[model samples]
Target chain A: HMVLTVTLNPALDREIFIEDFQVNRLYRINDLSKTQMSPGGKGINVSIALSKLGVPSVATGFVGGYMGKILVEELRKISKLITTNFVYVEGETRENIEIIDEKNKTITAINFPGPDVTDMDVNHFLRRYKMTLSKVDCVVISGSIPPGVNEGICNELVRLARERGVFVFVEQTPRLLERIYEGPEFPNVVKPDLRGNHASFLGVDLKTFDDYVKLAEKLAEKSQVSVVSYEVKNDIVATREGVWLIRSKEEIDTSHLLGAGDAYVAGMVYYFIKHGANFLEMAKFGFASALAATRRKEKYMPDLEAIKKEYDHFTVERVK
Target chain B: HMVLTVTLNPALDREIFIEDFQVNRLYRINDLSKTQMSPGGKGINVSIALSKLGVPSVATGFVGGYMGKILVEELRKISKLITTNFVYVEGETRENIEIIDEKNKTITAINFPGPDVTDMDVNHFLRRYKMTLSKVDCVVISGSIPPGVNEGICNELVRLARERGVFVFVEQTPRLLERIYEGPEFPNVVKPDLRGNHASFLGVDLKTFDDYVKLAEKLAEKSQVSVVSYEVKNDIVATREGVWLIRSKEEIDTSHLLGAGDAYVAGMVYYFIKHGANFLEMAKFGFASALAATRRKEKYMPDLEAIKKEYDHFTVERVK
Candidate 1:
C-alpha cells in the first residue's frame, strides 16, 4: 500500500549552535558552532517516519530553485521508500533556522514563508495530485499552503481524495479548516495544532479542556477519528464510539528528539491502514510511535522494531 | 583590462526584515515581513562594485552544491562583467543572514563559514586562480579562508599573481596576513579589517594612530599603498610619499547602505591600474566610491557617474 504526503511550504531546516546568542549583534561562526541542515516541512518528515516503519509513500507538493534541488536530493538521500513527485515552481523554497544557544540552553526559531506560486503552479499541482491519488491507498496532507496559491487548497485536496474513495488524513493549522465541512466528502482523520493563535476548530472555540472535548466529539461526526494534543503530555483521541485520553505513566522528556507530532500521525495512519478503523488500535500505535520518536534520537526515525519497543510504555484511559 | 576576485567563503546573503526581533524569542513570520537576498562575501561584493566602474573581472574560488549554483546564477544576474570560474566542491555554499528589526531599527548579522574543502579542492582552486592571473591585469583576493583549506592560500595566491607581474590587492581580516608579507612578493594594496578581534598588522599591535602609521610605513616599504580604516569617519591612506588622512567634510549616515569598504577597495584598484602609482587619485576616487556606495542603496552599486557625484564630499590631508 502507498501513501501520499503533501508539503506545500517545505524548508531546509538549519540548526545553528552557538556558545551564546544575542539579538542585534553580528556573529561570525566558525566550525566550532557548526550549523546542521535537514530536509524540513511536516509531510516530508511524516513520509520519512512512515518509511522507517517499512511503509512506502510518495512525497509531493510545491518546490523550486536551488533550495528545492537540495530538498529533492536530501529526500532521496534520506529514504529510498519516499519517491518525490513535487510540483516544480518559481523561486526557491524557504529556510527555517533554529538557533540553539549552548550557554543559555535556549532555542530561538526564525521561520520564513515559502516562495510565491502562480495559478498555473496550483493547477499543475492539482493535476499531479489527482493522478497520484489513483495509485495510493491513503492521502496525507500536512503543513501550511504556499503563498499566492489557493486559500481553500486543503479543502479541495481532501474533497478530491475522499471522492476517489481514498483514505484521507489532514494535519494543519488551517483557518480554512472551518470550510472543509461544507464540501461533499470529509477527511477520515484530522489533527488540529493551535500554533497561529488559532483558537477554534470547525468554527468553534477550543480554549479549555471541555472546549477540546466538544471539538473532538463534533469533529468525529465529520471524520472517522480526531486526535488533539494538549501541549506534550496529554492527547485527546476521539471516535464516534467514545472519547479517550492517551498519556504517559511517567512524564516523557522530549528535550532532545524535539518533534514527535509527525511521527504520531504517521503511526496512526500506518496502523489504521494495517487494521481497518479500530480507533483504540490507532491510538495505541500512534502514542507508542510518538514515544519511539522521542527515544530514538541517534536514528532520525524509529524502525518497526524500535516502535514496537515503545509499545509497552503507553496505555489508554477511557473518557466521557 | 581585467581583475580576478577570489571569495573563499562566499554566502547567499539573506536580509530578513522583521518587527521587534528579540534575542531568544521564537518569531513566526508572514507576508508583511519579506527577506531580501543577494550575493555575499567581500570578494563577490568587490566584483560587483568593480563591474559598476566599467571594470570586468572574473570571480573564482570554492563553491559547491545548490547554494553554490544559486551564488553563480546570482553573480551572472548581478553583472555580466563577472565571469565565474569557481572550483566546485562537495557541500552547499554558506548563507549569511542579516535580521533587521523594523520597529527597533537594529540589524543583527549572522554568518557561517563556507563548506569544508579537501586538499583536492584547494589544488583545483589554485590551478584555476593561477591560469586566470595570466589573462588578468589585477587580482583582488578578499574574505576569510574556507575550512579544511590551506590557511596560507592567500599568500600563495598573491605570490603567484605578483610573480606573473600582475597587480594584486588584498582585503581581508586575516591573522595569516603576517605570513603573506614574508613571501618575496608583497600585495600592491591591502585593507585589513579588524573585525575578528584582530588588533595587529605584521607582528605589531594596532592600538593607536601612531601604531597604524607605523604599520602603514612598514607595509609601504613592501606594498605600494596601505589603507587603515578608523571606525567609519576617518581613513589613513599611506605610501612611500607620505601618510594622508581621508575624512568626510561632514558626518555621513550609513544607516541605509551598510557596506562601503568593498566599494572603496574596488575603486582604488580601478584607479591604481588606470593612473599607475598616483596614490592621490587612488585615495580620492576610493573615498568617493565609498560615498557612492553609501548614497545609492537602490542601485546596489555605484557606476562611474555615481562615484563621480560624490567627489565633492571628501578631501584628503597629508599627515606625518
Candidate 2:
C-alpha cells in the first residue's frame, strides 16, 4: 500500500541565519552558512519524514508560478523516494522567510499570504486526488485550505478517500475539523493536539494528563483511531480495543521541538504500515519518534536505527 | 541615438503597506490596497523616468534565475518606450521589501544582497555593453556591483564606453567615485550629491554655495560635465565652459523627494540630448524637472510640458 501526503497550502521556506536578530534595525547577513531553502508545509514535511525512514511516499498539492516550480524541483532533489504530483495554478506560491538568530537561539518569521486559488485550480486537484487515491492505500490530508477554496471541500476530500477503502489521516484547522467530525464518516486516523479547539472537540478541560486520556477515549468513540499529543506532559492514544498513556522514561529536553507533532504522526503511520500494531505499540513508536526528533537542532527526522534503539526508553501504560 | 541605462544590482522591490508600522509587534495585513511591486534600482528608475518624458532608452544589466525573470517581465509590461537587454546568470536575483507606514508617513526598508555573478556572467555583460554602445549615444551606469563581481569593474566599464566615443554618465558609490576621479579619463557626465565623499572629491567643505561652485568648477576640469544636487538647498552644474548654481525661486514642499537625484540625472540627460544647452540652461532644466518630480507622492518623472511651463521658476547664476 503506497502512502500519499497532501498539502493544500505549500510554501517555499527561505531560512536565513543571522546573529542576534533584532527588530527595527538594518541587518547585514555576513555568512551564507546555514541559509536553507526547502519545500515547506505539514504534509510535505510528513512525506519527507517518512522518506527518511526508508518509507516511500507520493506528495501532492497545489503548486503555482515560479516559486512553486522552484519548490517542486527542490523537493525532487532532496530524495528520490518522494514523488511529486502537484496541480499547477496561476499565481506564484508564497515564500516565507525564517530569520534564525543563532546567537540568541530565536527565530523570527515573515510570512507572505499565499496566492489565491481559482476554482479551476481546485477542480484540477480533486481530479488528481481521486486518480492518485486509487493507487495509494493510506492518504494524509493536512494544512489550511488556500484562498478561493471552499472549506467544505476538505470534508469532500475525506469522504472520497474513505469510500475507496483507504485509511485517511487528517490534520487541519479546528473549524475544518468541526465540519469533518460533524459528518457521517470520519477519517480512519486523526491526531489533534490537546489545546484550543481540539480540547473543546472532546469536551474536556486541559489542566492535566488524565483529562487528555479521557479526551482521547471520547475521540476514539467518534473515529477508528484518535491520538492527542501534549508537549512535555504525555501523549494519549486511543482505539476501540484500549487506551494508552505513552511517556518517555527519561526527561527528554524539549527545546528544539518545533515539529515533534508532525514527527509523531509520521511515526504512527510508519508503524501502522509495517506492523498492523495495537494502540499501545503505535503510541510507543510515536513517542520514540517524537523524542528522537526533539534532540536534533534543525530537521525533524530521526535516524531509523537510532529511533529503534531508543524505543525501549518509552513506556506505554494501559488505561483500560 | 538611443539612451542606455545599466543596473548591475537590480531588485524586485516588494512594498508592504502598513498603518503606523511598529516594531516587535504582530501585524495583520488585512488588505493589499497599498502593497506594491516593481522592478527597482537606480538605473532602472532612470530608464523609467526617461520613458515618462517620452525619451526612449534600453536598459541592460545582469538578471539571473527565476526572480530575475519575474522582474524583467514586469519591466516589459510597465512601458514599451523602455527596452530590456539583460544577461542571464545562475542564481535568483535579490528582492527588497519596503515597509510603508501610511498613517505615520514613515518608510522602513529591508534590502537583500543580490545574487553572486560569475566571471562568465561579467564577461557576457561587458560584451553586451560593447555591442550596445555602438548603437547608443550615451550610457548611464548606476547602482552597486553584485557579489563575485570585482569592485574595480566599474572603472573598467566606464573606460570601455568612453574609449568607443560614447558619452558615459556614472552614478556610483563614494569609493568608486574616488577611483573614477583617480583615473586618467573620467566619464562624460557624473552626478555626485554634494555630501560625503562627493564634497571631498573636489577638496572642498560643504558649508556654502560658494564652496559648491568651487567644487563643480574643479570637477569640470577633470570631466566633460559635472552635476551636484543638495537636497532642499541648491543644485550645481559645471561644463568645460563654466559653472552655475541652480535654485528654485519658491520654497517648495519637500515631503516626496526620495528619488529627486535620479530625476535630476534623467532631466539633465534629456536636456543634453534635446538642446546642446550651456551649463546655465542645463542647470535650470534639471532644477525644474527635480522640483516638478517632488510634487508627486510616488514616482519621479516630471511632465515635460508642465516642466517647460514652469521653467522660469528656476533661477540659475553663473559662477564662472
Candidate 3:
C-alpha cells in the first residue's frame, strides 16, 4: 500500500514579470511579460514531493480539457507517481499568474476561475475515490472544495477511507475539518495551520489552539487514532499515546513558500510509517523537507544529504 | 491613360513600442506589436501620391509569400490602385522598422534584405509591360535596379516605349539615366535630384548637370524632344528649344523633402503634356510640384490649393 494525495482543484501557474516586487515603491510598472508555467495544487505538491524523495505515491482529483492533459504529463515525468484517475468535467482547465513586487517581496496572484464541476462530475470522483482508497495506506485530502462541490465531500472521503481501514490525514480549513466531529468517521489526523484554524474557529465548538487539540484528541480516542496540527512558528501533535511540541531548527528565508507545507506533510507521513510512529523522527523529517523546499524555491529538491543536514538540528519534545 | 508606380523591394514596416525610444533608458520592450507595409521604391511612392491626388495609377512590381500579399492588400486600399500584375518570386518579402524618438523627432530604421529577382522574372515583366505600355500616355520606369538587372534595363524600357511613340519619364540614379544617352532614342524628360545625379555622375559618365543637360538639348534638337533636370538648389532645365532657370516659391525644408523629386516629375509630365510644349508652364509646374511635395515628410499628398499657391509664386526664365 502506498500514500495517496487528493487535489479537488488544480491549475497551471504562470509567473508574469512585473518589474521589482516591493512593498512601498510606486507599484507603477510599464512592462509585463510571462515568466513560466507549472502544474499547481496543494496535494499535487505533496505527491510531487514524495516522488522527489523517491517515495512512490498515487495522486487523484478532478481536472478537465487541455490543462488536465498538462497535469497528467507532469505526473508521468515522476517515476514514482501512480494515476488514481481524475474526474473529467465539461470546461477547459485554468491558469494562474503571479504579479510580483520584486522590491517589496510581495506577490499578487491572478487566478483564472475554474470550470463548472457538474453534479455528475462530483459523484464520479467520490465513487472512484472510495474505490482507490481501499488499496492505499494513508489518504491525504488537500485544497479547497471546487465550485459546485459540497463541503461534506471531504468528510465523506474521510469516512470512506476509515471504513477500508486506511489512515486519513486531512490538511484543510476547519469548515471541512469541523465536519469530521459532526459526522460519520473522523480522520486520524486533521492538520490546520494556525491562521486557517483562526479564521475557521469563528463559530466552531472549539475555541483556542489548545482546545482544538484537546477536542481533536478526544475525537481520536473515540475514533481510535491521532491528530496533527501544523503551525508557522511551532508545530503540535495530539495522539492516543501523548501530546508533544515540534520546535523548528532555524527560521530561513522564504524564496519559495509554495510547496513547503505540502512537502512537510509528505515527510511527516514518510517518517511516521518508516520509524513506526516515532514522533521525534517524524517532526525532524517534516521540518527538514519543508525547510529544503523553502530554501531552494523552484529548483528545490529534497535529497538525502539536505534532508539529513536539516534533520540533525530539529528539536522535538514531549509537552507533558 | 493613368500613371503607374512600382516598387521592386516592398517591405513590411514593424513599429516597436517603447515609453521613449531614447538611449540608456532601460525600457522594457514588446516584440513587434504592429506593422505597416509600404511599396518601397521611388516609382511606388509616385504612384501612391498620384492616387492620393485623385489621379488614376496602377502599382506593379515584385512581391513574394505572405509579406507580398500584405503589400498588395495595403496598396489596394488606396483609390485608383490596381495590383493584379506583380512579379511572383519564390521567397518571402522583407520587413523594416523605424524606432521613432518622439521627443527628438528622429527615427532609427532596421531593414531586411529583400528577395532575389531572377532573369526570368525580368522577362516576365517586360512581356506584360509591353502590352500595357501601348495604351498609356506616359510610362514611368522608376526605382532601383534589382541585383540581377543592369543599369541599362530602364534605358531599354524607354526604347520599347519610344517604339510605341509613348512619352516615357525615367527617374533613377545617373547610371540608368546616363545609359539612355548611349542609345539613339532619348526619353521625353528626365528628373534626377541632386544626390541621384551625383551618384549618376560618379557611377556613369555624366560629370555635371550642365553636361547632362547639353546632351539632352542635343537629343531634343535631333530626336525632336525635351529633357528636364531637377538640379535641387540650382534648378536647371536644358532642351533644344533653350536653357531655363527654375526658381522656387520659397526655401525648401530638408526635413520635409522625401519623394519631392518624384512629385516634381509627375507634375512636369502631367502639366507639360496638357500644356502641349509650353516651356513657361512646364517649368512652373515642375518647380511648383517640388515646393508642394516638400510641405511634409514622406508622401503627404499636395492638395490642389497647395499646388496652385506654389505655382503662382514660381518664376521660370529661358536663356539662349
Candidate 4:
C-alpha cells in the first residue's frame, strides 16, 4: 500500500555557519564559514524519510517559480520511490534563514510564509487530492497553510479522508487542529504542537504538565490516536487502549534537535504500516527514531537503517 | 559611451519587515509583517542608477543557479539601458538577510558570501570582462570577491583597465584596496571606507576626523578622484585641485542608510561623464544622490530625476 504526504507551504532553508553573530554590523567575507540551501517543508521531510525506508509515497503541494524547480531536482537526487504531483502557483516559495553558532551549537532562525495559494490553485489541488486518495492506504497532512488558504480547508481535507475510510495523520499547528475539530469528522491520528510561540490551543494557556495530558485526552477522544510531545525526548501518546508517556533514554544534543518531530511521526507511521497496529509499540519506535535524527546535521536523515537500528532506546509508561 | 559595472560576487537581498524582532524565537506566519527579495551588489546597484540617468552600462559578474536567473529577470524589469553578461558559475548566489524594524526604522543585516567560482568560471568572467572594456568608457568594480577568488584578482582587474586607458572606480573592502595599491598602475577613482568593523587600513589605526582626512590625502595622490563619506549627510571629496567636505542640508532617517555608498558612487560617475569631468562638482552631485537614496525604502532608487532635483540640497566646503 502507498502513503501520501501534502505540503501546502514549502520553504527553501538557508543555513549559515558563524562562530559569533551580532546584529547591525555587516559581516566580513570570512566571518561566515559557509552557507547551505536545502528545500524544506514538513511533508517533504516525511516523504523523504518514508522513501529511505523503501516505502512508496507521493508528495503533493503547491510550489512556484525557481524554488519549485530546485525542489523537483532535489527529489530526483534522494529517492525514486517518491513521486511529486505538485500544483503550480503564482509566486516563488519563501526562504527561511537559520544562522548556526558553530561554538555554542545553537541556531537563530528567521522564518517566512510561503507563496500565496490563490482560489483557483486550491481548487486544482482539491481535485488532484481527491483523485489521488484511493491509490494510497494512508495520507499525511503536515506544515502550516500559506496565506490566502482558509482554515476551512483543513475541514475539507480531514472530512474527505474519513469519508473514504482512508487512514490519515495530521501534524500541523494547534490553530489548524482547532479548525479541524470544528467539523464532526476526525482524522485517524493528530499531534497538536502546543509548544508554539503563541502558546494557546483551545483559547486557554497551554501550561503545566497536567495541561498536556488533559489536552491529549480531549484530542484522543475525537480520534484513534493523539500525541503531545514536549521538551524533545518526552512524548505523551493517547489511544483507545490507554495513554502513555514515551521517553527516550538517549540524551540528544540541541544542535540537530529541531527536525526530530518529523522523524518521530515518520517512525510511528512506518511501524504501524510495516510491522503492526499497536500504538504503544509504534510510539516507542518513534521515540528511538527521533533520537537517531539528532546524531547528524542534515535536516532530514535519509537512511532507513539509521532509524531501524534504534528501536530499543526508549521506555514506555502508562499515564492513563 | 557605456559604463561597465563588475560585481564579482552578487547577493540576493531579503529585506523583511517586523515591528519587534528578537533572536532565538521562531516567528509565526502573521507575526512577520512582510518580506521582500531583491538583487544586490554594489556594482549592480550602481549600474541601475546609471541606467536611470539614461546611461548605458553592462553588468558582468559570476552568478550561479536560480538566484542568477532572478537577478537577470530583475534587470529586465528595471531598465532596457542596462545589459547583463554574467558568467554562469557552479553554485547559487548568496542571500543577504536584512530584518527591518518598521517602527524603530533600524535594519539588522546578515550578509553572506556569494557563489564559489571555479577556476574555469573566473577565466570565463575575465575573458568576458576584457571583451566588455572596449565597449565602455568607465569601469566600476564593486562588492567583495567570492572565497575561491584571491585578492590578486583586484590587481589584474585594475591593471588591465588602466592599460586600456579606461576610467576605473573600485568600491571594495580595505583588503582589496590594499591589494590594488601593490601594483604600479592605479584606478582613476578610489574610496577607502576607513570605518570597517576591523578599522586598520595599510598598517595604522583609522580613528578620529583627522585620520580620515590624512588617509583621503594618501588615496587622492594615487587617483584622479577619491571620496570618504561618513555618518549620513557629510562626505569628504579629494582631488588634485583640493580636498573638500560635502554636506547635504537634507535630513535623512537611518532606516535606508546602507545603500547610500553605491548611490554616491553612481552619482559621481553620472556627473563626471554627463555634465563634464570636474571632480569637485562630481562629488557634489554624488552627495545629492546619496541623500535621494535615503528618501525611499528601495535599496536602489531607479528614478534619475529623484537625484536631479536634489543637487541644490548639498553645499561643498574646502577641507585643505
Candidate 5:
C-alpha cells in the first residue's frame, strides 16, 4: 500500500451542453440542455481511476469553503478515498466551466481563481506532506497551483520528496521538470513528450528516429532519470538501459482528449508496480490507456477495451 | 437612556402597492411593481420611533432567523438602542402580506405564523431578561405574540420588570393585564381605550362618566399605575392625584394608523420626563402625538410642529 497522490489545488469541472449554442442570440432552448459538475483535479482523477482499476490509493490535498466541502463529500460517494484536512480560507474554491459547442465541435472554457493560500495554509499542507510521503512507495504530484503559487512550488515539493528517498513521478512542463532535475538528485521518473522537447528543437542536431532516440537516451543518462518523450506519430521511452519507440496506431480517431495523459500515467504506474517490467511494458500500458481515454466522453469513460482495440494496430520497434 | 419595548411575536409585513387599481377579477401584473417589506412587530415599531425621537430603548423577546436578524439590524441602525440576542429559535420569520382594496380604500391582509419557536428559544430570551429589565426607566410591552407566547408572555415580562423596580407600561389585552396586576408591585402605566364604552368589555363597569372615572381610579389605585383610556370623542388619563378627560381635535385625518399609539406613548413619556405633569398635560401630548403620527408613512414620519398645533385644540376636563 505505497501509492499516494496529491492535488494541492483542485477545482470544480462544470460541463454544460446546449443545443443550438449561440450566445447573445435569440434561441429557444428546450429539454435538450444537460450539465455535469464534478470535483476535478489531475491527481484526484488518477486516484478515482485507480480505485476503479481495483488499486487502493489515498488522495490528499488542501480544499476549503462550502464548495470544497461539497466536493470532498461527493468524492466520498465515488470511492472510499482517505482525504486529509483542507486548510480553511476566506477565498472560495474556483470553478472551471466547459461549454460543449456541439455544432462546431469545440469546448469553450472559462477559468476562475481558487482559494487563497495563506502562509499557515501552505505550512499545514506541508506538515501533512511528510507523513504521506514517508509511507508511500510511489508519490505522484501533479497539476497547476490555484493561480498564486509560482515557479518554486513544484521544485520545492520534488526536493523534499527526494530528500526522503520516496520514488517521485512528476508530469509537468519542460521548464519546471528541468528545475527539479537541476539539483544533484533528479526525480525518479520524468514523463516528457515532443511538446516539451526543447533539446530537439533548440540545441540537439537530431532529425531522424535514431537522432530522437539518441537524444532521449543522452538526456536520461545525463540526468540519471528515466525520460519518456511521446509524439503524435511515434512515442519514445528512453531509460539508461535502452530506448523503445512506439509507432502511431492506424485508424486514429480522437473522440475525447480530457484526462488522456493522466490516465496514461496511472496505467504506466500500475503496470510498473504490478509487473517488474522495463520501459516497453510500461509505455505499452501508457499508450493503451491514452488510446482508451480518447473513446469516452464524460459519462462513458474508458478503461481497457478501447486500448486493446486501438493498441492492437500499434507497432513498436527499436529506434536505434 | 433607559427604555424597554416588547414584540410578543410579530410577522414580517409585506406592504405591496401595485399601479392600475382594479378589483373583483384576477390581475396579471405586466410591469415591475413596487414592493416593500418590514418587520411588523408592534413594540419593535415603538422602539424604532423612540430611536427616531433620540430616545434610547431596548427591544426584547422572541424573533427568529432571517426575519429576526433583519428586524434586529434595522433597530440597531436607528440606535444601538435595541438588543436582540435572546430572541432566536429554529423557526423562520413569518411573512404577512397586505393587498390594498382601492375601490373601498381598505387593505386586505394575509398573515403567517412566522417561524416555529421552541421552549429553548423562549428560555434563552428569558435568561437575558433580568439585565434588560433592571436598566429601563419605562418598560413598554406591546404587540401580539405567536401562539407559543400568546397567553402569559406579557405577564411574565411585567412580573420580572416589577421585581427589579423598573416601571412597566403594558399594551396588551384585559386578561393578561389582570394576571400581571394580581401580583405585588403593579405596572406604572396602562393606555387602554374603550370603543363605544367597552370598559365593561375589558372587565370594567362603564355606564356613566362617574362609573368610568371610578373604574380608572380603581385600576390606578389597585395596580399603583396610571390608567389612561382613549375614546372617539376624548382621551381620559387617571392617577391618584386626579382623573382628566381630554377632548380630541376637530380634524384628525390620518393616512396610515400604524404607529399611532407608539407616537402617543413617546410624547407622553417625553413630556412626563421634562415636566412632572398631571393627566391633562399627559393626555394633551399623547393625543397630539397620535394625531401627528397619522400623517406620515413608514419612512417619512411626522415631526413636532404637527403635534404642537393640534395639542392646543385638545381640551381636558379634570374630575376631582
Candidate 6:
C-alpha cells in the first residue's frame, strides 16, 4: 500500500541561527553558524519522515514561481520519498523564517502569507489528486489552504477518498478540521493540536492526559481510527478495538519542534498499515518517531535506528 | 563621465515587517504589509541612487549560485542603473534581513557572512574591473569583502584605478578604510563613518560639528578628496582647497537607514564629476540625496524633485 501526502500551502523554510537573539540590536551572524533553507510543511515533513522509516511516500502540493522551483529542487535533494508531484501555480511560494535563538533555546518563526491560488489551480489539483488516488492506499492531507482556495476543498478531498474506499489522515487548521468532521464520513485518522481548546469545541475537556486519550476514543467512534498528539508529553491512540496511552519516558531536548507532530502522524500511518489494528505498536512507533525527531538540529526526519531504540523506552498501555 | 559601483559583498536584502518586533515570539506577518527583497549593498545602493539622479552607472560585483540569480533579477526590476556585470562565483550570495519595528520606528539588521571567493574569482573580477574602467569615469568601491578573498583586494582595486587615472570613491568597513588610507596612493575620495570613535582613532575628537569638518580636512591632506558622514546629522566634505559642512535641516523619519550612507557617496561622486571642484555643491547634493533617501518606505533612490527641494533646506557652508 503506497502512501501519499498533500500540502496545499507549502513554504520555503529558511532557518537563521543567532546565539543570543536580541531585539533592536544589529547582529552579525557568526561565520561558524549555519543557515538552512528547505521545502517545509506538514505533508512534506510527514512524507520525508515516512520515507526515513522505510515507508516510501509520494509528496504532492502546490508550488509556484521561482521559490516554488527552488522548493522542488530542495525536496529532491533532501527528501528520499518515493516521488514529488507538486502542481505548478502562478506566484512565488511563501518563505517562512525560523530564527533559532541558540542561547535562549527558543525559536521565533515569522510566517508570510503564501501566494494566491486561483479556481483553475484548485480544479487542476483536484483532477490531479483524483488521478493519483488510484495508486495510493492512504492519503494524508495537511496544512492550510493558500488564498483563493475554498476551506471546503479539504472536505471535498476527504469525500473523494471515501468514495474510493482509501484511508485518509487529516491534520489541518481548526476550521478545516471541523469541516472535515462535519462531512458525512470522517477520515480514517485525525490529529489536532489537542493542547488548545480544539477538543473543548468538540464538546470534550482535555484537562489531563486521560482527557486526551478519551478525546481520541470519542473521535474513533466517528471514524475508523484516530490519534491525538497532545504536545510531546503524551499521545493517545484509538482504534476500533480499544484506546491506548503512550508516554515519553524522558524529556526530549530540542530547540526546534516545528515538524514533530507531522513526524508522529507519519509514524502512526506507517505502523498501522504494516501491522493492522495493533494500537500498542502504533502508539509506540509514533511516539518514538516524534521523540527521535526532536533530536534533529534542522530537518525533522527521525533516524530509523534512534526510533527503534527510543520506542522501547516508551511504554504503551491499553486504556480500555 | 560614467559611474561604476562595485559591491564585493552583495546581498538579497529581506525586510520582515512587524509592528512591534520582540524576541522569542512567533509572528504572523500582517497580510496587508509587504515583505521586500532587493539586491542590496553599499555599492548597489549607490548605483541605484545615481541612476535615479539621471546619472547612469554600471554596477559590478561578485554574485553567484541561485541567490545570485535572484539578486540580479530583483536588481534588474528595481534599479535604473545602466548595467549589471557581476562576476559569477561558486556559492550563493548571502541574504541580510532587516527587521522593521514599525511601531517603535527602529530597524534591527541581521547580516550574514557572504560566500567565499576563490583566487580565481578575484582574478576574474580584476579582469572585469579593468575592462569596465575604460567605460566609466569614476568607480565607487564600497561594502565588505567576502571570505576567501584577501583583505588587501580593495587596495589593489584602488591602485589599478589610480594607475589608469580614474577617480575612485571608497566607503567600506573600518579595516578596509584603514587599508585604503594606508596604500601608497590614497583613493581620489574616501568617506568613513565618523561616529563611535572612528574619527577619534585618527586622533581627531568629534565633539562638535566643526570637529567633523576638521577631520575631513585632515583626511583630504592625505587623500585628494574626503567626506566624513556623522550618522545623517551632518556631513563634512573636503577638497584640495578647503572643507565644507552640510547639515540636515529637519529630523528624517525612517526606520531603515541601511543604504543612506551609500546614497551620500553616490551624490558626492555625481556632483564632483559634473561640477568639478565645487565643494559646496558636492556637500549640498550629497546631503540632500541622503536625507531624501530616508523618506522612502523601502529602497533608497530618492525622488529627483524631492532631492532638489531638500537640498535648498540644507545649508552647505564653506568652513575653511
Tens digit per residue, CA lDDT, model 1, B1-320: 88889888888887776777876666767764366778878888889988877788898888888778878998899778889988999887888777776556566778888788999888888887878888989888888888897777778989999999998889877476777887888998887776645555676687888887787788888988888776576788888888998888877654334457888888888897677768768877888888877763222567898888887887788897
Q: Report iRMS values in order.
A: 2.1, 3.7, 15.8, 2.8, 20.2, 1.7
DockQ of each: 0.50, 0.15, 0.02, 0.41, 0.01, 0.58
TM-score of every model? 0.88, 0.80, 0.48, 0.92, 0.47, 0.92
List clashing residue pairs in candidate 5.
B92-B115, B94-B114
Top candidate when judged by DockQ against the true structure: 6
Candidate 2: list runs displaced more than 4 Å: A22-24, A31-37, A104-106, A118-120, A193-220, A224-264, A275-320, B20-30, B104-106, B192-221, B224-261, B275-320
Cα lDDT over the full model 5? 0.61
- Tell me the tens digit of each residue's lDDT in model 1 across A1-320: 89999999898888776656877677888765443468888888889888877788999989998778888998889778999999999898988877766556556778877889999999999999999999999988878778898777788999999989998888877475676667778889888765545565665676778888888888889998888876566788889889998877666654334457788788887897787878778877878887877763322566788789886787788887
CA deviation > 4 Å runs, candidate 5: A18-33, A81-88, A193-219, A222-234, A250-255, A299-301, A304-310, B1-320
Tens digit per residue, CA lDDT, model 5, B41-103: 667766666666667777776777666666666556656655554467766566554544333
Weakest ten-residue segment in model 1 chain B by summed lDDT:
B293-302
Score candidate 5 by TM-score against the native: 0.47
Q: What are the per-residue Cα lDDT tens digits for candidate 5 across A1-320? A: 55777777676675555444533222222222355667777677777667666676777766766557657877778776444445555555655545454545545444444665767777777777777777777777776565445556677777778888777776765555656656666566666534424453324545666666665675677433344544454577777767777766664333245566777777766776777546677778777777677664452234555556766756787654
Say which docking band candidate 1 falls in.
medium
lDDT of 2 by residue, B78-161 (tens): 789999999998886777766655456555555677878899899988898889888898889887778788877888878888
- TM-score comparison, 3 vs 5, better candidate: 3
Clashing pairs in 1: none
What are the per-model C-alpha RMSD values against the true structure? 3.4, 5.2, 15.5, 2.8, 18.1, 2.9
Task: Give the range of the ten consecutive residues with the poorest summed lDDT in model 5 chain A.
Answer: A24-33
What does candidate 6's lDDT look like per residue over B70-109, in tens digits? 9888888865556899999988798888988767888878
Q: What's the C-alpha lDDT at position B57 in model 5? A: 70
Single out the weakest 10-residue window by summed lDDT for candidate 6 chain B.
Answer: B193-202
Shift of residue B11 alpha carbon in model 2, Å: 1.8
The parts of candidate 1 lying over 4 Å away from their true place are: A32-37, A101-107, A115-128, A247-259, A274-276, A291-300, A304-318, B24-33, B102-105, B198-201, B248-259, B295-299, B312-319
